[PDB]
Every structure is written in structure tokens, then in C-alpha cells.
Design a protein around this ligand. Structure first.
Ligand code: NA
Length: 582
């Protein structure tokens, strides 16, 4: 149960380093001891401290389950969280190598990381503040606007394809072993000036990823690698803010072992034992705020039943445009969505908010709040989206299958609400409420494939009775509708024989269009009940035609109906849309 103290301002590196009286000055000292830590051991940084040009790497060690390694703060809360700032320095730089093709991507190279956790299990990092700033780079999200001239705003970017990859925090498994019980709590990562382009290097706010311990060159490497898997388990990332980072905000689970997970795409189903063995289990991503990532907000990759809840994404895809994403090379990737999964099995995304995913007008080929990408059994529920530049939800191409999307609310998402380009079968879209403004419509123009629409409230938030295109394409049977409400439309889907039609949204819900237009300044999520309840406009009014109008639903993907958008138990015959009448 040893416990180190690092100050700076009060510290001195000649000191013993143990006890509050005798703190170390720098993190150089922590790094010399870092590999020997230490179940029950800790390293407390002093609130107020500023470790400029420093970093904290921890390689090849662990806690046990009775006593994890800490790394946290000490002293007066009110002095502000201790800063670790690596400023890209030589010491923070390491050679990253997946040791395998991981698709059309940089898989290998130099990386600056401020807080590196390489095969460290039973560790918990908390109450820190992490930067990886470059003074040459500055384009803050708080004052970002699109201008006719690049870097007009007193701003400046490094648009080089070969820009050094930078991370705030990286967790790396590359021993052929599990890395487990890693917890990140109440961190404030920002100004990680990474590579604008690279998706699968440790490049952005937080990134967890796994490598083969060696290149797969023979019969005998391939027997071993099949059994000995760098993977994650019980990774928890909560109460943190990531802000002004390139590329990814928060990404977890990309792995060289996709060479076995993706060997046979088949019909897009994903075997339970495959994803359990080669993928990351018990990943949880809770109560985070992500703002002004260059690319995607939060993304789970190759994860087995992860839980993504109470997070707020906001104004991401900042550099996915034609004036910033100028060197895509043969890698491409001028696309980003909000909060979503890649080749996961039955991920649950619930009670999230996603706002203002940017730049679909300016070269972001996606720009959606939610994206059930390739993967199987994705569940998006009780989420709110506002103001995304391209759709609320995409279901992406052949191997995006068995999606459920329910009890979500979409408000002023632009250029289509649902984006269904060549997606696989098994998708179910029910009890959602969508407010569709003149800048949008129900489906994206490029939509062409499967979804079953039931119990939804579609709201034409324009000043005429709109004649909507309810159907595009027929790939995998295209779009079928049953038991939905259409508000203020001239037409309905020809496939719906249980249509409920309403003339005027004011007799259907208390105040449609009135949910927030912005994240809370703190980045915490909006209240749904009590004095600050931000969603009461989407409640059905007395005599609403949405009361007891929905069919009992049978979820295509075996997820039992539990509650509504506001935590209320769904009774017998459900109400239409996302919110039951009280
Ligand atoms: Na900067």
C-alpha cells in the first residue's frame, strides 16, 4: 500500500516522494517506478499542478481486484485538476504497430501519448486533465464557424497526412493477453492536436486498441494467435470530458484480431463465441461529454454487448470538410457520425444526446447522430438527437443487420431523419417521435433498403400539408409501415393500413420542437423529470390521438419493451411515439 505524491510548485525531485510532506517535482520520477506498481499502490498529483512537457506511461503491470493501481489527485479540489501536458515531446512518443493488416489504414508508426497504459490491468485513473497540444494548431470548437476562407477565424491547422498521431489517453493490449478492469473517471482531455485523417492509430482523445504480439507469418504463429488474444475486458470510461481533439473523441476496441472476427462476413450475424473470444467484453461508456472532436464522437469496435449510456456528443466532425480534410491520400475517410458501433454484438446505446454533428454540407459524407454500422443487434433507445447535418440514424450497408431503434426523439435533424443505404435485413424502428423541419424529410435521398416502421410519430414541422416520399428503393423489401401517426401531411405510406392521421401537432403533444437545441454548458445530460425537465414538450396532451393508439410490438431482435423516453413503464396497449401519457 505505497503512495507517491507529485507537486511541482512545492515539489522537489531529490525527495523521497512518499508522504504529502515530501512530494516529487516531476513525472519523470513516476515513470522510473511506474512499471513496478503495484496492487494497492497510488500516485497522487497535486490539484493546481502543471506538468508541462511531461507524460505518464505505464507498461506491463497490474492490480489484483482487492487493490487496483490508482493515479489520481490530492489537496484542495478548488485549485483545479492537475494538468499533464506532453506538448508532443520526444519522451511521449512510441512505435505503434498492429502487426497485421487492419484494413485500408495507417496501422503502424510514431505516436505521442500523454497517458499511455500498455497492458496494465486493475488500474483506475481519475480527476486528471490531459492535453497534447501543438501551439502551431488552434481551432477551438467554442468559436468555430464555417468561413469562405480556411483558417479565417484567427485559427490554424496542420493539414499534413503524415502529421504525427497524438492521443490523450491510450490503452494498448499487445501481449496476446487480456487487459482488464481499467477505469477512467472524471478526466478532462483537450487540445490533443493529432492527425486529422488517421482513424485507427491512437489518434484522438481516448483510444483503446489491441495488437498481435508478433506478425502472423506461419502455421505456428497462426495457431498461437488464434488462442492468445490481445483484447479488453471491464473497461469503464465515465464522467469525463473530451474536447478539441483530432481525430476520434473516444474510441474503444479496434484490434488486429479482426483478421479472425471479419474472416467470414456471412450474412452479417456475429457468433456469440467469436465476439466473446476475439472481441472486448463488459465495456461501459457512461456519463461522458464529447465536443469538437475532428472526427467521430464515441465509437465501440469489436465489442461484445457494451453499454453506452448518459453520454452527450456535441459538434463533432469539425475537420471532416473540404477546407480541412485536404490530404486523404488513398485512405479516404471523410466521414464521421456521432455515437455508434462497428462490428459489435448487441450493443446498447441508451439515454444519450447527440447535437449538431457538423459538415455534411461541406464534405462530411455521413454527419448523422447515430449509426448502426456493420454489426448485429444494435439497440438505440431513449436517445435524443438535435441539429445533426445529415440524419438522426443511418443503418449502413449489407452487414448492418438486426437493428432496433426505439423510443428516441429526433428534432431538427437535417436532410432526412432515417438513412437506409443498402443496409441488411432485420431492422425495427418503433415508438420514436421525429420533428421534421423544412431542412429535412423522413428518408435521406440515398435511402433504398429495409426498415419496419411502427408506432412512430412523424411530424411535418412545415407550414403546408406536405406530400412526403415515404418509400425509396426495394432492396431487402424496402420500407414497410404499420400503425404510425402522420402529423400535418397530405399523404401517408401506401403500406400502412393502420394509419393514424392528425392535422395539427398542438392537439397531439404539449410543445413539439421545444427540446434542447444545445448541450448543457457543463456537458452533463439534460433532466427528463422535475423542475429542469427539458423534454415535456413531447408529452401527449389530453385527448391526444396518440393515447392508447399503438399496437403491442414484437421486437424483431428479441428486446422486450420496458419503458419510454422518460423512464415511465409502458403499460398494456402502448401510446404512439416516444412518451407515454402520465
Ligand atoms: Na492547439
Amino acid at each position: 500500500g505505497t503512495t507517491y505524491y507529485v507537486s511541482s510548485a512545492h515539489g522537489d525531485d531529490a525527495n523521497a516522494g512518499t508522504s504529502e510532506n515530501a512530494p516529487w517535482k516531476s513525472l519523470t520520477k513516476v515513470n522510473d517506478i511506474a512499471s513496478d506498481l503495484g496492487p494497492g499502490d497510488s500516485v497522487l498529483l497535486e490539484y493546481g499542478s502543471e506538468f508541462n512537457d511531461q507524460y505518464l506511461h505505464i507498461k506491463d503491470t497490474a492490480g489484483n481486484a482487492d487493490a487496483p493501481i490508482t493515479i489520481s489527485a490530492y489537496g484542495d479540489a478548488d485549485e483545479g485538476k492537475p494538468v499533464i501536458a506532453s506538448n508532443g515531446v520526444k519522451g511521449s512518443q512510441w512505435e505503434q504497430d498492429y502487426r497485421a493488416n487492419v484494413g485500408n489504414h495507417k496501422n503502424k508508426g510514431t505516436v505521442s501519448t500523454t497517458l499511455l497504459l500498455k497492458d496494465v490491468s486493475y488500474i483506475t485513473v481519475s480527476n486528471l486533465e490531459i492535453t497534447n497540444d501543438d501551439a502551431d494548431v488552434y481551432d477551438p470548437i467554442d468559436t468555430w464557424k464555417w468561413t469562405d476562407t480556411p483558417d479565417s477565424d484567427g485559427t490554424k491547422l496542420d493539414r499534413s497526412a503524415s502529421r504525427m498521431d497524438r492521443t490523450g489517453v491510450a490503452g494498448i493490449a499487445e501481449n496476446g493477453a487480456t487487459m482488464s478492469n481499467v477505469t477512467l473517471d472524471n478526466l478532462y482531455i483537450h487540445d490533443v492536436d493529432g492527425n486529422i485523417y488517421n482513424k485507427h492509430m491512437a489518434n484522438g482523445g481516448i483510444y483503446f486498441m489491441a495488437h498481435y504480439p508478433m506478425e502472423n507469418t506461419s502455421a505456428e504463429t497462426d495457431v498461437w494467435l488464434r488462442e492468445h488474444v490481445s483484447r479488453f475486458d471491464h473497461v469503464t470510461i465515465r464522467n469525463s470530458t473530451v474536447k478539441d481533439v483530432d481525430r476520434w473523441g473516444i474510441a474503444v476496441g479496434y484490434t488486429a484480431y479482426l483478421n479472425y472476427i471479419d474472416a467470414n462476413y456471412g450474412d452479417g450475424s456475429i457468433d456469440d463465441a467469436l465476439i466473446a473470444k476475439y472481441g472486448s467484453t463488459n465495456v461501459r461508456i457512461e456519463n461522458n461529454y464529447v465536443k469538437g472532436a475532428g472526427g467521430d464522437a464515441i465509437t465501440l469496435m469489436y465489442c461484445d454487448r457494451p453499454v453506452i449510456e448518459h453520454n452527450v456528443g456535441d459538434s463533432v466532425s469539425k475537420h471532416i470538410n473540404t477546407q480541412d480534410y485536404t490530404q486523404p491520400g488513398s485512405y479516404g475517410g471523410r466521414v464521421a457520425a456521432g455515437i455508434w458501433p462497428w462490428r459489435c454484438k448487441d450493443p446498447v446505446f441508451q439515454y444519450n444526446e447527440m447535437y449538431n454533428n457538423l459538415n455534411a454540407e461541406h464534405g462530411n459524407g455521413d454527419g448523422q447522430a447515430w449509426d448502426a454500422d456493420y454489426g448485429d443487434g444494435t439497440l438505440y433507445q431513449y436517445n435524443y438527437s438535435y441539429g445533426n447535418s445529415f440524419a438522426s440514424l443511418m443503418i449502413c450497408n449489407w452487414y448492418a443487420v438486426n437493428t432496433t431503434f426505439r423510443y428516441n426523439i429526433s428534432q431538427n435533424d437535417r436532410q432526412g431523419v432515417f438513412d437506409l443505404p443498402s443496409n441488411g435485413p432485420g431492422n425495427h424502428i418503433y415508438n420514436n417521435t421525429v420533428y421534421v423541419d423544412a431542412d429535412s424529410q423522413v428518408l435521406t435521398k440515398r435511402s433504398n433498403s429495409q426498415s419496419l416502421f411502427e408506432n412512430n410519430i412523424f411530424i411535418n414541422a412545415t407550414n403546408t400539408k406536405k406530400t412526403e416520399t415515404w418509400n425509396r428503393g426495394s432492396q431487402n423489401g424496402g420500407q414497410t409501415y404499420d400503425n404510425n401517426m402522420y402529423v400535418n401531411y397530405a399523404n401517408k405510406p401506401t403500406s400502412d393500413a393502420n394509419a393514424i392521421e392528425a392535422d395539427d401537432v398542438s392537439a397531439v403533444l404539449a410543445g413539439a420542437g421545444s427540446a434542447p437545441t444545445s448541450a448543457l454548458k457543463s456537458g452533463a445530460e439534460h433532466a427528463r423529470t422535475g423542475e429542469k425537465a427539458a423534454f415535456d414538450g413531447y408529452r401527449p396532451v389530453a385527448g391526444s390521438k396518440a393515447i392508447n393508439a399503438g399496437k403491442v410490438v414484437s421486437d424483431l431482435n428479441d428486446y422486450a419493451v420496458e419503458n419510454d423516453f422518460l423512464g415511465n413503464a409502458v403499460k398494456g396497449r402502448p401510446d404512439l411515439g416516444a412518451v407515454e401519457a402520465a
